[PDB]
Design an enzyme around this catalytic site. Structure first.
Site, short mmCIF file in Angstrom:
data_model
loop_
_atom_site.label_atom_id
_atom_site.label_comp_id
_atom_site.label_asym_id
_atom_site.label_seq_id
_atom_site.Cartn_x
_atom_site.Cartn_y
_atom_site.Cartn_z
N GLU A 226 19.30 54.68 -2.38
CA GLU A 226 18.63 53.68 -3.19
C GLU A 226 17.22 53.39 -2.69
OE1 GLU A 226 20.64 49.95 -3.31
OE2 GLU A 226 19.70 49.31 -5.19
N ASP B 67 14.53 50.61 -3.50
CA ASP B 67 14.15 49.39 -4.20
C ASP B 67 12.65 49.19 -4.20
OD1 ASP B 67 16.82 48.74 -4.76
OD2 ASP B 67 17.06 47.75 -2.82
N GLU C 157 12.10 44.17 -5.96
CA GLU C 157 13.14 43.15 -5.95
C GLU C 157 12.42 41.81 -5.87
OE1 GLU C 157 16.84 43.50 -5.27
OE2 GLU C 157 16.51 45.49 -6.14
N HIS D 185 16.79 52.40 1.14
CA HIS D 185 18.16 52.43 1.63
C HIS D 185 18.66 53.86 1.78
CE1 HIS D 185 18.80 48.07 0.86
NE2 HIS D 185 17.98 48.28 -0.15
#
Ligand SMILES: *[C@@H]1O[C@H](CO)[C@@H](O)[C@H](O)[C@H]1NC(C)=O
Ligand SMILES: *[C@@H]1O[C@H](CO)[C@@H](O)[C@H](O)[C@H]1NC(C)=O
Ligand SMILES: *[C@@H]1O[C@H](CO)[C@@H](O)[C@H](O)[C@H]1NC(C)=O
Length: 428
Positions: free
Chosen positions: A208, A210, A213, A224
């Site tokens: 992942e 991001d 956010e 991640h």
């Protein structure tokens, strides 16, 4: 999961720009709603396979039999889920009658997701976070999802990308109703504070990234890593994530390497009002650059003014880019080791070199109340604790049932999406 047509499935068209050294060219695209928001029912009737937070006992005895007996149905994007697209703009509404939040994926066509190769390229987008108070999250990120939703690997899946199947992340979510062409009825525990969700036996893991956010109060940039770059099925507490007895027992990193300007020291860079360098009442451009090394560069554009990522001092580290040096310095200064344990930047760089699906969502936190984003976290840490304060919101703010009633008309607008090599998205 199978396919029913009690309602037709029409993906709202969204235009994005593909950039190169000589210019940027418009691209035809559309967004598809996640399978979990859809009405799951019998293939031969209107009998629900999943109603409230409890599965059908007769249609879904086991995971494999359920997928054979149950179907996914078309979604009223505007009427039910409050999702509208207008040229460049994708507008997501927080609350619609009988519905809260949404998760959508950009598509190449109706049958396939649009896969992006971030390595050596940069991603740019305009965002309106003015209507996003505490407790909400206007999220834009990339995940290593199968382009077809996993139809090739799993024959139980007859829906595919056309109905938003095969979602994965680093949290290895067990809340998914359908994973790998199978249901998640086995070991399903209904949620205590949510009358629409629950936790199943299996889950879904993938790398992942991001990119966004954020709300009006705070914004975070988090990579991640997962031990397995692609999509894998998890089993029980083995997957890990927020909802499990162990958070760091999975093959993925739930915490990540995060860059929050507020958390790193600068409390006057991002927020509502003229005071902040980036006024959240007004919309801004967010550009994220990915180097072949895996290093992440960032600059913002608001009202024609270019803002570099603010330089942060974390231990011995000094700079404004996400790298192994920062990620190791952040782990030493604030605590935790989950990022480097799953391979770190070198591991998630494999995800940048592979294909990742663009995800655009709006949601509230039923587990933590989004305190990890815009407030002091965790509860067991003081304001004095290093890296505890991440925003300027109260520790009581973010309660899902409070923010749904207080601000149901909250919305996030994603527009002007551009993708191309580093230094190509800006102009031509
Ligand atoms: C859909 O998308 C993929 C990747 O863009 C492409 O290879 C494939 O030909 C497309 N399928 C269609 C248009 O039927
Ligand atoms: C934080 O915000 C802006 C970033 O451009 C800068 O002008 C200001 O000096 C920074 N404040 C700090 C580092 O304390
Ligand atoms: C602090 O809170 C976390 C949960 O977020 C918990 O796992 C940890 O053990 C707590 N205790 C200490 C001493 O930090």
């Amino acid at each position: 999961q199978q396919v029913c047509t009690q309602q037709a499935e029409t993906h709202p068209p969204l235009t994005w720009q593909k950039c190169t050294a000589s210019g940027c060219t418009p691209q035809q695209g559309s967004v598809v709603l996640d399978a979990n928001w859809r009405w799951t029912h019998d293939t031969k009737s209107t009998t629900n396979c999943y109603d409230g937070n409890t599965w059908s006992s007769t249609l879904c005895p086991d995971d494999a039999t359920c997928a054979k007996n149950c179907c996914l149905d078309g979604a009223n994007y505007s009427g039910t889920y409050g999702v509208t697209t207008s040229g460049d703009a994708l507008t997501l509404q927080f609350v619609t009658a009988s519905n809260v939040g949404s998760r959508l994926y950009l598509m190449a066509n109706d049958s396939t997701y649009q896969e992006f190769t971030l390595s050596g390229n940069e991603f740019s987008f305009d965002v309106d976070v003015s209507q996003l108070p505490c407790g909400l999250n206007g999220a834009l990120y990339f995940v290593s999802m199968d382009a077809d939703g996993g139809q090739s690997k799993y024959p139980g899946n007859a829906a595919g990308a056309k109905y938003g199947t095969g979602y994965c992340d680093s949290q290895c979510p067990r809340d998914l109703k359908f994973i790998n062409g199978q249901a998640n009825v086995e070991g399903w525990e209904p949620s205590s504070n949510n009358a629409n969700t629950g936790v199943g036996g299996h889950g879904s893991c993938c790398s992942e990234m991001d990119i966004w956010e954020a709300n009006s109060i705070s914004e975070a940039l988090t990579p991640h890593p997962c031990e397995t770059v692609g999509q894998t099925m998890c089993s029980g507490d083995s997957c890990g994530g927020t909802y499990s007895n162990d958070r760091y027992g999975g093959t993925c990193d739930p915490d990540g390497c995060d860059w929050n300007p507020y958390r790193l020291g600068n409390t006057s860079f991002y927020g509502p009002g003229s005071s902040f360098a980036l006024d959240t009442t007004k919309k801004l451009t967010v550009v994220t650059q990915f180097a072949t090394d895996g290093s992440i560069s960032r600059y913002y554009v608001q009202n024609g003014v270019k803002f570099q990522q603010p330089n942060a001092q974390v231990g011995s580290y000094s700079g404004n880019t996400i790298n192994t040096d920062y990620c190791a310095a952040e782990q030493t200064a604030f605590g935790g080791t989950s990022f480097t344990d799953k391979g770190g930047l070198a591991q998630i760089n494999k995800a940048f070199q592979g294909g990742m699906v663009l995800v655009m969502s709006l949601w509230d936190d039923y587990a933590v109340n989004m305190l990890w984003l815009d407030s002091t976290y965790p509860t067991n840490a003081t304001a004095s604790t290093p890296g505890a304060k991440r925003g300027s919101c109260s520790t009581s703010s973010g309660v899902p049932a409070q923010v749904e009633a207080q601000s149901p008309n909250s919305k996030v607008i994603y527009s002007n999406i551009r993708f191309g090599p580093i230094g190509s998205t800006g102009g031509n």
